[PDB]
Amino acid sequence: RFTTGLVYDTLMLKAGRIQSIWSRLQETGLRGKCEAIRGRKATLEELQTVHSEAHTLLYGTNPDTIWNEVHSAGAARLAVGCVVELVFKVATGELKNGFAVVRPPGHHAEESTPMGFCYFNSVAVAAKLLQQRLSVSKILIVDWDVHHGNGTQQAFYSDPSVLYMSLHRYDDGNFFPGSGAPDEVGTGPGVGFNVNMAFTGGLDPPMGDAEYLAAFRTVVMPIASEFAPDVVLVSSGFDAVEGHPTPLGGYNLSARCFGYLTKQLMGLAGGRIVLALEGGYDLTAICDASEACVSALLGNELDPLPEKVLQQRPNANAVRSMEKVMEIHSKYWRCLQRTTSTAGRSLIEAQTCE
């Protein structure tokens, strides 16, 4: 069946996050309509596309204490394999789109550094193989986890074939992990092809749906469409959703909204989209968003957004964060060179003017 795939495996387990998510997906019936595929460990060679051999050898090998982390490393290896496996099946046609219910997160682990609960950058190794083994010419990586995807930025900071974009809380380098200034735009041949949609201004107020929805309207989608990729890999973290406190979270997106965001990202690349779980720790929130994202992947009719949110103009701290990022990347993209700024308008308004 040519439909929305999933990837699960209970050998990734220490109810937990991915277990709850998977449960929701069953009970809601979305799991039925999807094609659950088989996973595998990532190969040492596969992991070395992104990481160093020294790092691979240390953490890749099978040899409330020290052995906790060892299993989490063993899980992370399997995570990369699942994410590799789904991505290839969607990319080659076998499936329409996907969603990897995998843990731990990955987008933090750097070349030879395990940080932020992350051992191996799943979404990255996936992208690396797409290039090498399927000669894919353009890969879009949207990373909507609340945090900056420092691993993923580094992986492709010189390759203009992989457009990396990241919506995150930045606060002028006063948040985890600290990287991800909008000023960072790539390097060498890959200048212009790294876009940090970096929110500055703290929680006054907290960034919400309208703020992110604006950000898509004005930055993400314009650049992505122009760029026009063959495969979309989303580092789909749900720590932006409501119910993650100030420090290990901060913002208040509805889960509902992430469906809309999936729905929009499906516009690109023939719908060749795959989402992969990163952050998001509140069990209701991540179950909600997972429900919404997969529903949208199956092309189910979506629950309309509250009139309120559709009518709400984005907060100043956002509008200011958008204009700075837009300004910078107006140097490298035509859809930012033509126009005057409209990042202060609500959705309904922006559409009232098409």
Ligand X SMILES: O=C(NO)c1ccc(C(=O)N2CCn3c(-c4ccccc4)cnc3C2)s1
Binding track over 115-154 against K ion, x by CB under 5 A:
----------------------------x-x---------
Q: Does 169 bind Zn ion (CB under 5 A)?
A: no
**Residue 239 makes contact with Zn ion by CB under 5 A:** yes
Closer CB to ligand X, 115 or 316, in the complex: 115
- Binding to K ion by CB under 5 A, coded x per residue (else -) over 178-217, reads --------x---x--xx-----------------------
Query: Which does residue 99 bind out of K ion, Zn ion, ligand X, none, counting CB within 5 to 8 angstroms by kind?
Result: none
CB of 15 to K ion, least distance (A): 26
Return the residue of 17, 77, 147, 168 that touches ligand X, per CB under 6 A. 147
Q: Choosing among K ion, ligand X, Zn ion, none, which partner's interface includes residue 242 (Cβ < 5 to 8 Å by kind)?
A: none
Per CB under 5 A, does 278 bind K ion?
no
Choose the one of Zn ion, ligand X, K ion, none that binds residue 282, judging by a C-beta under 5 to 8 angstroms depending on kind.
Answer: none
Q: Which of 143, 209, 211, 278 binds ligand X (CB under 6 A)?
A: 278
Does residue 249 bind K ion (CB under 5 A)? Answer: no
Interaction of residue 116 with ligand X, rule CB under 6 A: yes
User: Of 74, 81, 105, 186, which one interacts with ligand X (CB under 6 A)?
Assistant: 105
* Shortest separation between residue 163's beta carbon and K ion, angstroms: 7
Q: Which of residues 202-261 bind ligand X (CB under 6 A)?
A: 237, 239, 247-248
Three-state secondary structure of the chain: CCCEEEECCHHHCCCCHHHHHHHHHHHHCHHHHCEEECCCCCCHHHHCCCCCHHHHHHHHCCCCCCHHHHHHHHHHHHHHHHHHHHHHHHHCCCCCEEEECCCCCCCCCECCECECCECCCHHHHHHHHHHHHHCCCCEEEEECCCCCCHHHHHHCCCCCCEEEEEEEECCCCCCCCCCCCCCCCCCHHHCCCEEEEEECCCCCCCCEHHHHHHHHHHHHHHHHHHHCCCEEEEEECCCCECCCCCCCCCCEECHHHHHHHHHHHCCCHHHCEEEEECCCCCHHHHHHHHHHHHHHHCCCCCCCCCHHHHHCCCCHHHHHHHHHHHHHHCCCCHHHHCCCCCCCCCHHHHHHCC
In the list 180, 279, 314, 344, the residue contacting Zn ion (rule: CB under 5 A) is 279
108 given a catalytic annotation: yes
Cα-based distances in Å from 334 to 34, 132, 212, 342: 39, 29, 22, 16
Of 55, 108, 244, 329, the active-site residue reads: 108
Q: Give catalytic residues, as residue numbers.
A: 108
**Residues in contact with ligand X by the rule CB under 6 A:** 105, 116-117, 145, 147, 176, 237, 239, 247-248, 278-279
